[PDB]
Amino acid sequence: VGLFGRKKTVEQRTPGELDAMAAAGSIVGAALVAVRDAAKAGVSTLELDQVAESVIREAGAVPSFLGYHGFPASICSSVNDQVVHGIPSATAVLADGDLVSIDCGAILDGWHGDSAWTFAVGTVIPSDEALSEATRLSMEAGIAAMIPGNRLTDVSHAIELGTRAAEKQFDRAFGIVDGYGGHGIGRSMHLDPFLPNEGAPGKGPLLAVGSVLAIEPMLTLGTTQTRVLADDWTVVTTDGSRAAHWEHTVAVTEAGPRILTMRP
C-alpha cells in the first residue's frame, strides 16, 4: 500500500465545494473563539465542550468529533504536556499558567472543517509563549507552501523549516512530535494523504488548484516522543515537557492559500 494514498493529485475541490467547506470551517472558527473566551481559571474542560457544542449546533452543523471512533466529546482539550486528544471532563479544571490546546471539527451539509489552536490561561510562562508561537509559525510556514504544482512533502518540509527558524528566533529547541500529522479532508474528516510535519521536500502527490489539506504542526519543549494515557485517547509527551498544537483546513487556489477555517 502507498503511504500517501493512490491518487497522483490531492483531490481538487471546485469553487462551490470550497465555499461549502469554508461555511463548515467558519463554524469551527466560531466554536474555537467561544471556547477561548470561556476558558478562565476555574472552568472545567467539560464546560468548554458544552460551549463548543452549542455554537456548532446553533449554527446548524454537527460536531464531527462526537462519537468519532467512540470519542465522547465535541472538542479535544489537551492541557500542558498533553499533546492531542485530551478528553473534556468535569475534573480537568483550568488553572493560571496552563497551556491549553483546543481541537474542533464540524460538518455542515456533508462538508468538514478541522482547526485547532493553543493559548494560555492567565499569564503565560515565557517558554510556553515561545512554544505556541513557534507552532503557529510552523503552520503559517506550511500554509505558504500550499501552491499549485508543489508536492505534498514540500508542505512538510516548509513546516519543518518554519520550526527551525522559530528555534533561531526564540533561542530554544523544539521537539517535532513524532508519529502525528495533517491529512486530506472533504466529505470525511480524515482522508489520504497523511501530511507529515517534517521530511525531505518533493515527495507524495501533487497539489493543484482546489486541493485541500488540514495542516497541523505539533511541537514540544523537549522530546519528540509521546505515549497514550490509560483513557485510550489522551496523548502526552514522554518527558513531561509541554506541547502546543495549531491547525487550519487550507485550500490551494489560483490566488494563493485560502484558510477555510477562518475565525470571526
Rg (CA), the chain: 17
Q: How far is the CB of 181 from Cl ion (least distance, A)?
A: 9
* Among Na ion, Mg ion, Cl ion, none, residue 190 binds (CB under 5-8 Å by kind): Cl ion
The three cell numbers of residue 86 are 485530551
- Judged by beta carbon, residue 6 or residue 168, the one nearer Cl ion is 6
Site string for Na ion, 91-110 (x = CB under 5 A): ----------x---------
Instruction: Quote the least distance from Cβ 111 to Cl ion, whole Å.
Output: 17
Binding site partner of 243, from Mg ion, Cl ion, Na ion, none, Cβ cut-off 5-8 A by kind: Na ion
Using CB under 5 A as the binding rule, whether residue 39 contacts Na ion is answered as no
Task: State phi, psi for 238 to the nearest 5 degrees.
Answer: -65, -20
Dihedral angle sign, alpha carbons of residues 219, 159, 117, 186: negative
| Residue (76 or 124) nearer to Mg ion, CB | 76
Of 3, 19, 15, 21, which is closest to residue 213 (Cα–Cα)?
21
Candidate ranges 37-45, 58-66, 229-237, 242-250; the one touching Mg ion (CB under 5 A): 242-250
Q: Which of 197, 209, 122, 187 is nearest to 164 (CA)?
A: 197
Which positions make up the binding site?
85, 103, 114, 183, 190, 216, 247
Q: Which residues bind Na ion (CB under 5 A)?
A: 78, 101, 243
